[PDB]
Amino acid sequence: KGKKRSGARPGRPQPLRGTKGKRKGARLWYVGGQQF
Amino acid sequence: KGKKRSGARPGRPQPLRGTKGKRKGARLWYVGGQQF
Amino acid sequence: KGKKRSGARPGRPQPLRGTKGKRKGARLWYVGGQQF
Amino acid sequence: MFQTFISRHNSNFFSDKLVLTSVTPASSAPVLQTPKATSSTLYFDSLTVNAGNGGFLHCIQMDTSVNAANQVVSVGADIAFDADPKFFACLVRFESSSVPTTLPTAYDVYPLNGRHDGGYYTVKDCVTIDVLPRTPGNNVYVGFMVWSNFTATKCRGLVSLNQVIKEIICLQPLK
Amino acid sequence: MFQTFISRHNSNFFSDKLVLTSVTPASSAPVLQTPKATSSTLYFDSLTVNAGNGGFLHCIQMDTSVNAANQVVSVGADIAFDADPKFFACLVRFESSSVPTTLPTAYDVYPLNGRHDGGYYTVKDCVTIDVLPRTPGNNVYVGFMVWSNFTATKCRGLVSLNQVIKEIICLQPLK
Amino acid sequence: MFQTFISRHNSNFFSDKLVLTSVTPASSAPVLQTPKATSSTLYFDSLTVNAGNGGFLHCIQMDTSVNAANQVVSVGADIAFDADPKFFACLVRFESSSVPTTLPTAYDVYPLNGRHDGGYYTVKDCVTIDVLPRTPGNNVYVGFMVWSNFTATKCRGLVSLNQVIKEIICLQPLK
Amino acid sequence: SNIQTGAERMPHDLSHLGFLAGQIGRLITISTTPVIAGDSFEMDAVGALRLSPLRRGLAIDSTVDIFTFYVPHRHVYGEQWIKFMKDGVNATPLPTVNTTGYIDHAAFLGTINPDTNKIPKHLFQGYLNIYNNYFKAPWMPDRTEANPNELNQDDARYGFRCCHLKNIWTAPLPPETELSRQMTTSTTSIDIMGLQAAYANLHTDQERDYFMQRYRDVISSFGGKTSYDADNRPLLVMRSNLWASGYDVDGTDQTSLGQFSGRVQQTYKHSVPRFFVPEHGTMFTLALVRFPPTATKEIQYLNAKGALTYTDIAGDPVLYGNLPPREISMKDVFRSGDSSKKFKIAEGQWYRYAPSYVSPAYHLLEGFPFIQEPPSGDLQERVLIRHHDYDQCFQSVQLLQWNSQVKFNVTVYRNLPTTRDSIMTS
Amino acid sequence: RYRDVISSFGGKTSYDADNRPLLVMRSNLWASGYDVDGTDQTSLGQFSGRVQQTYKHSVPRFFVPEHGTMFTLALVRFPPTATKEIQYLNAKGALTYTDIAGDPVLYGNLPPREISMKDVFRSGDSSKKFKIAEGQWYRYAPSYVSPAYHLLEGFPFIQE
DNA sequence: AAAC
DNA sequence: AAAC
DNA sequence: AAAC
DNA sequence: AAAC
């Protein structure tokens, strides 16, 4: 259960850079080979 | 009795953040339970 | 007699803050009592 | 192109029909409809103008709650006379300590930047006026007034007045 | 000189021919063509105006998907009557819970900053209007309306209306 | 939309009635009313124009206390002639070491950006003029002048002149 | 039944935000906290002081004074209050003064006008006491209105006019200062001993005129002291003074490049150290914003009063140390001074003071907070600040001449039961 | 709420006991930003507040006991500052001993006080009532908005 | 007023 | 009230 | 729910 | 191709 709040992240906003988590794992896409 | 003046608070103004004092005390609102 | 010049006071201008000298002395106004 | 988001006249969201049907122009220029307070848009698809040598006007009551001596009063109007009265148009400022029904004896006039074409008249202009009563008990009124040596005739149109005591937002797609 | 990149009226890339050929002006001002949704440019090189005492108009349906109460509606028109109807022009706002074919009994009017010259009429103006239905089930409509004591006659021209719910880009050579 | 807060002509809070009733146009263009100093708005609901070949004008006295050679002089006017004099309008600059009653022999003219429609004339323009005396003892005067081969006739209207030696505040609701 | 007879003193957080606005020389209430006998009060006001946008760049800082006074209710209801406390529960309810029907007509008391149009008399009276004991010039008559509805819309909405910062013209000797004193002598003799006495009495007069118009001052003169209860004066708990400043905004469009707008944002902090409240009352906090009295037409006395005599130019100490106050006119120190408007100055004052100089090029230039024409009127009208003298200084806005956004941190160590002791029957 | 009645007994109740969503984490913050200075002929002296607030909501590891959804919601609010709230003692008539004295025996012993929207607001509906704790007015202080701000756009104040 |  |  |  |  919930508690301390913290959006008080002192900083100027940064443009969203990348929708891929923090820790990844196994492979997810199979397309027949490499695709850039 | 009155005396030394001090609004000389060297700083850029800050938006008012919160109308709740500095030191609080006992509970003031009773609404039937928790309310966020 | 005159001599070295110095308005070279390196600084951004500051709004005039107060027409009362640097060293004051005796009391100058008498109005019947205190007046803020 | 980008959209122009600035106007000299912002007409009120609601307009009113002139309930009157004839006016007989005069020095004591009759007030076409009881004045509203800050902005009003009056339209009449047929008004009968009796021969008369004076004018007629449409008023707003200045809102005097913001203590700001000079405010902008804007006017928006498109009017069509059946005949060409050869009239002069203007903004009028007058005070009255009671609902006015005719122009008082004292008033001031201000030129607009309209366009006259025969008996046709259109304007979209604003003027800064001293909106608080010059005399303590009165109400100040600002209106759109037409003045000429009128001949019986008829007119059609709308006249919109607005006191800029506040601004109007609108969507600005890039914000 | 630099190029002006701001306009009060951005007409739609495609215009439509008025399929109608005569209108008989009325209080229940007939809607010239079934309304389109956000912007439409209607042109008619010959329209026959029957004697009538009321008006006729050209409508757009307000797009009510962006919850922004006040939006700018712009109008662009160049019209030529064979005779000079001595008419007044305006923007009209009315709602209807069904495709309208005539002006409903309730509507509001707003003055444009056009120019009348005889039977000629041209305008390029915008107005901020309250574009969401004032009444829950309706559709709001905004149009360009002409009103007079019409005599049989004929007219030529185009009338363009646009709801500024989005802006329009254009090339800006220095960017 | 936002409100336009910029104008080319800011008329004075108080206007004056032309106490005169007929003018007979001439080369020595009569000054309609004794000049006021920085800004004045003159209105006449009936002026009789005698046949005359010259002009008539309405003046302001330039305020020469701010040592700034070029200042902006603005004009605001709506005038209606009973007949169409086919006249040209302009701003006039002349000096005189005494209250003028007619245009002196030497003067300069400047074009306005008005609009002529028959006998109707309306303008809202400003011009930068050299406002200090070109000659040491004089007073410089700037006015609105009408010139034609006048026929007896009548006119109605207001003419407002203002010397921009200071600006005018007005409320700006967002500040 | 047994009831909750006691309470234990604990900190009460009476903190609140303040959205303020006023005119330039008018005293306005910005916060008020009603206090109970025996509580301890402390406050930390921290906010920003802003002026309306000005027409050109910053030229002069304005000075700001924030005051906190304590006004016991006894002081306001007198005998009636005493009896109320004694009567206890069935005491007759306290009197309520009347306001004018407008939303801002009680604004001077830092409050919205209730629809009924009345407020607690202590709120209105406390303000008058504060004004009359510390802000009017000692010699002006007290403000004695019975109800706020007797006030003009500018006094009611913006607060009462305060005096200018002291000047030769702004702080002349009191109006009735005597320039002479006769001793009725006999026809061909004078009483050497009566003369002596004559001088002793004038002395006593002179002191009351110049320094002791108020009873409390007459006593200090004796070397005694007088409680605030002795003359019913609001007690000044704390006072802060400051200069507000800001920065210029550079215009950058085709027409306004070379043009600036001064932006005055001033962070300030008003701190009232803990205060023991001896009896029930209100704690009033007021603000006053003022500019030094710079007139665009003041002249140096010696440069504007004709031919110079030995007495005026030489600086002879025996002369200055011994002759009566000099009566001067508004014309001796101002370009459009009314020669008919007189004032009494100390001899040699012109050598103890120097006016500010404003080159004539600035005379009607808008955007400078200068006084453009010399104050015209009686002595009182000239010393009381006139906020319109500053109208041409600012951009016209709905928030008057200055606005402030503050956070009033206030802690009161009071002793009343808990909100639930309060809502629980048992 | 049933769960509260039990805590009162000093017992505990699982989220399964009354079917309540379990609150895993909660973050609270004040958003701020900066003003943009206008600089054209007409808007020099004018500003626009820009609120950009970087925030971070972190939910520590959580063991999911049974299949379900993890909901994350946001709520943005301003303190309830009305432009017309009055101090109770300043807006309800004549003051009685019970209202002004701060007598602890009174406040500690009488029923809740029924008040109207008119006792605390300039255009308060006297017909709209509410029950307050006696002495509440001495435990609370409303914010003050000078009347000069009443219909001034750009302030998040409640106008009526 | 030998006081929650 | 920069006071015998 | 600043709780015998 | 997070591969017996």
- As a three-state string, the secondary structure of F108-166 is EEECCCCEEECCEEEEEEEEEEECCCCCCCCEEEEEEEEEEEECCEEEEEEEEEEECCC
Contact F38, F61 (CB under 8 A): yes
The CA-CA-CA angle for residues G180, G181, G187, to 5°, reads: 120
Question: How near does any CA of chain B get to the CA of G77, in Å?
Answer: 23
Q: Which residues of H touch B15 (CB under 8 A)?
A: 32, 49
| Continuous segment of H or E residues that includes residue G204 | helix G192-210
* Residues whose CB falls within 8 Å of the CB of residue G293, separated by 6 or more in sequence, listed in order: G164, G165, G167, G170, G371
> Contact G374/G337 with Cβ under 8 angstroms?
yes
- How many of the other CB atoms lie within 10 Å of CB of H61? 4
Which nucleotide minimizes the distance between its C1' and the CA of A28? Answer: L2
Residue D136 phi, psi dihedral angles, 5° rounding: -45, -40
C-alpha F27/C-alpha H113 separation (Å) is: 88
The sign of the dihedral angle between the CA atoms of D93, D97, D98, D103 is negative
Measuring alpha carbon to C1', the residue closest to nucleotide I3 is G6
User: Cα(first)–Cα(last) distance of chain B, in Å?
Assistant: 43
Closest CA to G249 of B15, H47, F173, H50: H47
Closest of F155, F23, F14, F161 to residue F101, by C-alpha? F23
Q: Are G358 and G370 in contact (CB under 8 A)?
A: yes
Q: How many helices (H) and strands (E) does chain F have?
A: 0, 12
- List all residues 6 or more positions away from G182 whose beta carbon is below 8 Å from its beta carbon: none
C26 touches strand J (CB under 7 A): yes
List chains adjacent to chain D, taking adjacency as at least 3 C-beta pairs closer than 8 Å.
E, F, G, H
Measured from Cα to the C1' atom, the residue closest to L1 is: A33
Q: Does B1 touch chain G (CB under 8 A)?
A: yes
Residue D30 backbone dihedrals phi, psi, to 5 degrees = -65, 140
Residue found by looking up tokens 């000692």 in the block: G138
Taking Cα atoms as reference points, which of G64, G78, G20, G70 lies closest to residue G40?
Answer: G70
DSSP, collapsed to helix, strand or coil, labels residue H9 as helix
Paired with F145 in beta bridges are: F57, F90
Give the total number of structural domains in chain G.
1
Q: Are G66 and B7 in contact (CB under 8 A)?
A: yes
- Rg, chain C, Cα only: 17
Handedness of CA H137, H142, H148, H152 (dihedral sign): negative
DSSP-assigned beta bridge partners for residue E96: E139
Check residue E132 and report its DSSP letter. S
Q: Do D58 and D33 meet the contact criterion of CB atoms below 8 Å apart?
A: yes
Phi, psi of H107 (to 5 degrees): -50, -40
> Is the Cβ–Cβ distance between G156 and G107 less than 8 Å?
yes
Calculate ∠ Cα G368-G257-E2, nearest 5°.
150
CATH number at residue E9: 2.60.120.20
Task: Mark F36-72 as b/e (b = at least 16 C-beta within 10 Å).
Answer: eebbbbbbbbbbebeebebbbbbbbbbebebeeeebe
Q: End-to-end CA distance of chain C: give it in Å, rounded.
A: 43
Q: Are D129 and D68 in contact (CB under 8 A)?
A: no
Residue D23 belongs to domain spanning: 1-175
Note whether E75 and E63 are within 8 A (CB): no
Cβ within 8 Å, pair G6-H104: yes
How many CB atoms within 10 Å of residue G349? 19
* DSSP tag of G132: I
Three-class DSSP labels, chain A: CCCCCCCCCCCCCCCCCCCCCCCCCCCCCCCCCCCC
Q: What SS3 state is found at G294?
A: coil
Contacts of B7 (CB under 8 A, 6+ apart): G49, G64, G66, G240, G241, G242, G244, G266, G267, G268, G269, G270
Helix (H, G, I), strand (E, B) or coil at E84: coil
Q: Are there at least 3 beta-carbon pairs closer than 8 Å between B and H?
A: yes
What CATH number is associated with residue G191? Answer: 2.60.169.10
Q: Which residues of D134-147 are buried (b: 16+ CB within 10 A; e: fewer)?
A: eeeebbbbbbbbbb
| Own/partner pairs, G337-341, CB within 8 angstroms, 24+ separation | G337/G374, G338/G374, G338/G376, G341/G376, G341/G377, G341/G378, G341/G382
Q: Which residues of H touch A4 (CB under 8 A)?
A: 26-27
H-helix segments, G33-135? 73-77, 79-87, 121-130
Q: Does H46 touch chain F (CB under 8 A)?
A: yes
- Tell me, what amino acid is at E26? A
Which nucleotide across the nucleic acid strands is nearest to B30, CA versus C1'?
K1
Dihedral sign computed on CA atoms, order E99, E101, E103, E105: negative
CA distances from G60 to E26, E64, G51, G294, G390 (A): 67, 52, 12, 10, 13
Task: Of G311, G296, G257, G279, give the one whose Cα is nearest residue G392.
Answer: G296
User: Based on the number of CB atoms within 10 Å of its own CB, is B5 exposed (0-12), middle (13-18) or buried (19 or more)?
Assistant: buried
Please name the residues in contact with G279: beta carbons below 8 A apart, sequence gap of 6 or more: G37, G72, G73, G74
The number of residues making up chain F comes to 175
B/H interface, count of CB pairs below 8 Å: 18
Amino acid at H23: L
Q: What's the number of CA atoms in the CB half-sphere (13 Å) around residue G221? A: 13
Strand positions, DSSP E, E31-163? 39-49, 52-61, 70-81, 88-96, 108-110, 115-117, 120-130, 139-150, 153-163
Residue of H nearest to A3 (CA): H26
How far: G183 CA to J2 C1' (Å)? 31
CA H22 to chain centre: 24
Considering only CB atoms, which chain C residues are within 8 Å of G243?
Answer: 17-18
Domain count, chain F: 1
- In angstroms, what is the resolution? 3.0
Residue E40, classed as helix, strand or coil, is: strand
The region that residue G88 occupies, defined by phi over 0 for left and psi between -120 and 50 for alpha, beta otherwise, is: left
Nucleotides of L strand lying within 7 Å of any protein CB atom: 1-3
CB contact under 8 A, F41 and D109: yes
B2 torsion bin: left (phi>0), alpha (psi -120 to 50), beta (else)? beta
Q: What is the DSSP string of C1-36?
A: ----------S----B--S--SS--S----SSS---
The answer to whether H109 and G5 have CB atoms below 8 angstroms apart is: no
Q: Which residue has the tokens 């943009």?
A: H36
CB D114 within 8 A of CB D90: no
Touching subunits of C (3+ CB pairs, under 8 Å) are G
Nearest CA to H15 out of B35, A2, A3, B31 is that of A2
Residue among H2, B23, E164 nearest D170 (CA)? E164
Structure-block tokens of residue G270: 């008003």
Question: Phi and psi for G95 in degrees, rounded to 5?
Answer: -60, 150
Cβ D68–G391 below 8 Å, yes or no? no
For this PDB entry, the determination method is X-ray
- In chain E, the residue whose alpha carbon lies closest to the alpha carbon of D15 is E108
Cβ-Cβ contacts under 8 Å for F123 (sequence gap 6 or more): D113, F75, F76, F77, F89, F112, F113, F114, F115, F144
Characterize the bridge pairing of strands G402-414 and D115-117.
unpaired
Q: If residue G218 lies in a helix (H) or strand (E), which one and from where to where?
A: helix G215-222
In angstroms, what CA-CA distances link G184 with D30, G189, G191?
75, 11, 10
Minimal Cα–Cα distance from B33 to chain H, Å?
7
D34 to each of D101, D161, E115, how far by Cα in Å? 7, 14, 29
Question: What single letter denotes the amino acid at residue D106?
Answer: A
Q: How many CB atoms lie within 10 A of CB G388?
A: 10
The alpha helices in D39-169, defined as continuous H runs, are none
Which amino acid is residue H115, in one-letter code? I
DSSP state, residue G139: T
Protein-to-nucleotide distance from the CA of H8 to the C1' of I3, whole angstroms: 33
Of H22, H23, H58, the CB nearest to A6: H58
Q: In terms of C-beta density within 10 A (0-12 exposed, 13-18 middle, 19 or more buried), how is residue G154 classed?
A: middle
Q: Are G386 and G158 in contact (CB under 8 A)?
A: no
Query: Is F74 in contact with F166 (CB distance < 8 Å)?
Result: no
H helix or E strand, kind and range, residue G318? helix G317-320
Helix (H) / strand (E) element for H2: namely helix H2-9
Q: Do H151 and D166 touch (CB under 8 A)?
A: yes
Q: Measured on CA atoms in the order E101, E102, E103, E104, is the torsion positive or negative?
A: negative
The answer to whether H144 touches G111, Cβ cutoff 8 Å, is yes
Residue E108 is nearest to which of D10, D15, D123, comparing CB atoms? D15
Where residue G189 falls (left for φ over 0; alpha for ψ -120 to 50; beta otherwise) is: beta
Give the sheet arrangement for strand E139-150, strand by strand.
Answer: E52-61, E139-150, E88-96, E108-110
| Token pair recorded at residue G58 | 């910053």
Considering all nucleic acid strands, name the nucleotide whose C1' atom is nearest to the C-alpha of residue A27.
L2
Please give the angle made by the CA atoms of G186, G189 and G195, to the nearest 5 degrees: 80
Task: Pinpoint the alpha helices (H) of G49-191.
Answer: 73-77, 79-87, 121-130, 153-158
Q: Domain containing G3: what range?
A: 1-426
Which residues on G lie below 8 Å from D68 (Cβ)?
Answer: 396-398
Could you tell me which residues come within 8 angstroms of residue D58 by beta carbon, excluding any fewer than 6 positions away?
D31, D32, D33, D40, D42, D143, D144, D159, D161
Q: How many CB atoms lie within 10 A of CB G80?
A: 15
